Amino acid sequence: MEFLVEDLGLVPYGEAWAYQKRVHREVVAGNRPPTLLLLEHPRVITLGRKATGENLLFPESWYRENGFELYWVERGGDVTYHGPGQLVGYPIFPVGREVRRFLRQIEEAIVRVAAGYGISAYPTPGYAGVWVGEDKLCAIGVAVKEGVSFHGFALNVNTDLNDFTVIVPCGLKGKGVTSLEKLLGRKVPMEEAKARVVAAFAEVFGLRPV
Ligand SMILES: CCCCCCCC=O
């Protein structure tokens, strides 16, 4: 019937990760409703299941020297970047066995958010995440353990898109990355993007937000 939204604001990746795991435990135990965490991270690169050292353009020592944190994680995908101005959403939801369906629902929610801004976005038949033309507006990479999801999505609102140039994803993809700011030619308030994401999730999943 319901999902809980928690706005964590700006939180370091490591502690936010530990929080994800604690939230996940409670949902698995049936002691917390499905939970959508909304937040930002300080500049961080994460390397998922498919990731290798060639997903990094520079040596990894360079990243830490230049203001990035770097972590190896168990989510789908290879490399991604999170940083200020990017709305990171961690839906920690009792999805069961239907992971592909859950991914499609996240995609749909993001497509709805973009539509609210007058932007035509699509999952694309062939590339993970949500795209506007040849550019990726939102990365998506989930993990599921004991039938409950963690990690999630990363919607570019006012992201510093220049920070993506130092990472080199592998596989089938479009040409670039984009943000609501870049597409609209002006910054979009983070509090507003959060509200619209909540509204979109409520609609797609058919749950009332608390
Ligand atoms: C929380 C968003 C994670 C997105 C990871 C997708 C990377 C694709 O290869």
Collect all residues with Cβ–Cβ distance below 8 Å to 142 and sequence separation of at least 6.
Answer: 75, 76, 99, 102, 103, 106, 149, 150, 151, 152
In this structure, are residues 85 and 189 in contact, taking their beta carbons and an 8 Å threshold? no
* Residue of minimum CA distance from atom 5 in ligand 1: 141
DSSP state of 145: E
> Is 170 annotated as catalytic?
yes
Nearest-CA residue for atom 2 of ligand 1: 153
Tell the CATH superfamily of the 1-206 domain.
Answer: Bira Bifunctional Protein; Domain 2 (3.30.930.10)
Q: What separation in Å is there between the alpha carbon of 107 and the centre of ligand 1?
A: 12
Of 78, 72, 153, whose CA–CA distance to 109 is shortest? 153
Residues 6 or more apart whose CB falls under 8 angstroms from that of 61 comprise none
Q: At what angle do helices 190-205 and 99-116 cross, to 10 degrees?
A: 130
Q: Measured between alpha carbons, how far is 156 from 190 in angstroms, rounded to an integer? A: 10
Catalytic annotation, pick one of 29, 115, 170, 184:
170
Instruction: Round to whole Å and give the CA distance between 78 and 128.
Output: 11
**Of the residues 38, 45, 80, which should be mutated to test ligand 1's pocket, given the most ligand atoms within 8 Å of the CB?**
80
The Cα-based distances of 111 to 42, 174, 196 in angstroms read 25, 17, 11
Which of 6, 34, 14 minimizes the C-alpha distance to 147?
A: 34
User: What per-residue string of b and e applies to 79-89 under the rule 16 or more CB within 10 Å gives b?
Assistant: bbbbbebbbbb
Label residue 26 exposed, middle or buried (CB < 10 Å: 0-12, 13-18, 19+): middle
Burial of 166 (0-12, 13-18, 19+ CB in 10 A): middle
Experimental method: X-ray
For ligand 1, atom 8, which residue shows the shortest CA distance?
A: 77
Q: Residue positions in the annotated binding site?
A: 75-82, 139-141, 152-154
With CA atoms as reference, report the closest residue to 127 among 139, 119, 143: 139
